[PDB]
mmCIF file of C-alpha atoms in Angstrom:
data_model
loop_
_atom_site.group_PDB
_atom_site.id
_atom_site.type_symbol
_atom_site.label_atom_id
_atom_site.label_comp_id
_atom_site.label_asym_id
_atom_site.label_seq_id
_atom_site.Cartn_x
_atom_site.Cartn_y
_atom_site.Cartn_z
ATOM 1 C CA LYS G 1 -3.369 -31.345 -11.247
ATOM 2 C CA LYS G 2 -0.674 -28.757 -10.448
ATOM 3 C CA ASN G 3 -0.250 -25.539 -8.419
ATOM 4 C CA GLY G 4 -0.342 -22.102 -10.013
ATOM 5 C CA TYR G 5 -1.757 -18.577 -10.057
ATOM 6 C CA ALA G 6 -5.401 -18.916 -11.081
ATOM 7 C CA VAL G 7 -6.600 -16.487 -13.771
ATOM 8 C CA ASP G 8 -10.120 -17.037 -15.016
ATOM 9 C CA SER G 9 -10.211 -16.507 -18.800
ATOM 10 C CA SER G 10 -7.591 -13.813 -19.645
ATOM 11 C CA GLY G 11 -5.181 -13.310 -16.735
ATOM 12 C CA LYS G 12 -7.718 -11.654 -14.456
ATOM 13 C CA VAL G 13 -7.051 -13.460 -11.157
ATOM 14 C CA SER G 14 -9.829 -15.377 -9.348
ATOM 15 C CA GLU G 15 -10.249 -12.272 -7.117
ATOM 16 C CA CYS G 16 -9.909 -13.275 -3.379
ATOM 17 C CA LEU G 17 -11.801 -11.052 -0.964
ATOM 18 C CA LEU G 18 -11.004 -13.996 1.350
ATOM 19 C CA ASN G 19 -8.979 -17.229 1.128
ATOM 20 C CA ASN G 20 -11.935 -19.624 1.471
ATOM 21 C CA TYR G 21 -13.572 -17.920 -1.546
ATOM 22 C CA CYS G 22 -10.408 -18.265 -3.686
ATOM 23 C CA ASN G 23 -10.276 -21.931 -2.700
ATOM 24 C CA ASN G 24 -14.002 -22.507 -3.414
ATOM 25 C CA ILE G 25 -13.951 -20.840 -6.852
ATOM 26 C CA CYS G 26 -10.803 -22.743 -7.737
ATOM 27 C CA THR G 27 -12.335 -26.115 -6.887
ATOM 28 C CA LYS G 28 -15.476 -25.047 -8.805
ATOM 29 C CA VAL G 29 -13.875 -23.829 -12.064
ATOM 30 C CA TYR G 30 -10.226 -25.033 -12.135
ATOM 31 C CA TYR G 31 -10.671 -28.206 -10.000
ATOM 32 C CA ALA G 32 -8.143 -27.286 -7.352
ATOM 33 C CA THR G 33 -8.271 -28.921 -3.946
ATOM 34 C CA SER G 34 -7.547 -25.451 -2.441
ATOM 35 C CA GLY G 35 -6.045 -21.941 -2.922
ATOM 36 C CA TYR G 36 -5.937 -18.541 -1.190
ATOM 37 C CA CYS G 37 -4.632 -14.978 -1.497
ATOM 38 C CA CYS G 38 -0.943 -15.630 -2.126
ATOM 39 C CA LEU G 39 1.251 -12.442 -2.034
ATOM 40 C CA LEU G 40 -0.594 -10.683 -4.902
ATOM 41 C CA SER G 41 -2.898 -13.309 -6.544
ATOM 42 C CA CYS G 42 -5.165 -16.318 -6.051
ATOM 43 C CA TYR G 43 -2.939 -19.283 -5.684
ATOM 44 C CA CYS G 44 -4.488 -22.605 -6.274
ATOM 45 C CA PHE G 45 -3.334 -26.096 -5.326
ATOM 46 C CA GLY G 46 -4.788 -28.782 -7.649
ATOM 47 C CA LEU G 47 -5.874 -26.816 -10.829
ATOM 48 C CA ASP G 48 -6.729 -29.760 -13.091
ATOM 49 C CA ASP G 49 -7.620 -27.624 -16.037
ATOM 50 C CA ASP G 50 -5.165 -24.752 -16.597
ATOM 51 C CA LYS G 51 -6.740 -21.708 -18.166
ATOM 52 C CA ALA G 52 -3.369 -19.894 -18.397
ATOM 53 C CA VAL G 53 -2.098 -19.968 -14.820
ATOM 54 C CA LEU G 54 0.433 -17.237 -14.012
ATOM 55 C CA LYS G 55 4.130 -17.555 -13.341
ATOM 56 C CA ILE G 56 4.905 -17.576 -9.612
ATOM 57 C CA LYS G 57 8.214 -16.101 -8.407
ATOM 58 C CA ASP G 58 10.327 -18.547 -6.365
ATOM 59 C CA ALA G 59 10.140 -16.437 -3.238
ATOM 60 C CA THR G 60 6.341 -16.223 -3.699
ATOM 61 C CA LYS G 61 6.102 -20.026 -4.271
ATOM 62 C CA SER G 62 8.297 -20.695 -1.248
ATOM 63 C CA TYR G 63 6.337 -18.143 0.849
ATOM 64 C CA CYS G 64 3.062 -19.705 -0.316
ATOM 65 C CA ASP G 65 4.094 -23.397 -0.028
ATOM 66 C CA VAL G 66 4.620 -24.314 3.643
ATOM 67 C CA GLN G 67 1.242 -22.688 4.350
ATOM 68 C CA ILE G 68 -0.542 -25.850 3.116
ATOM 69 C CA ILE G 69 2.396 -27.895 1.682
#
């Protein structure tokens, strides 16, 4: 279980019309505990499987940490 940018099967992000949805999908498919619209992608926190999660920039990580962690 890690944290990462959740892309479904080929780098297409897990959408995110709204944070709760990102989170839900990510628990459902990746086995996150949560996730949301980080700066320009679905973050997830807990992705157990890792499809090919994207490479977060420090500033984006940092920005998108304190939020939940």
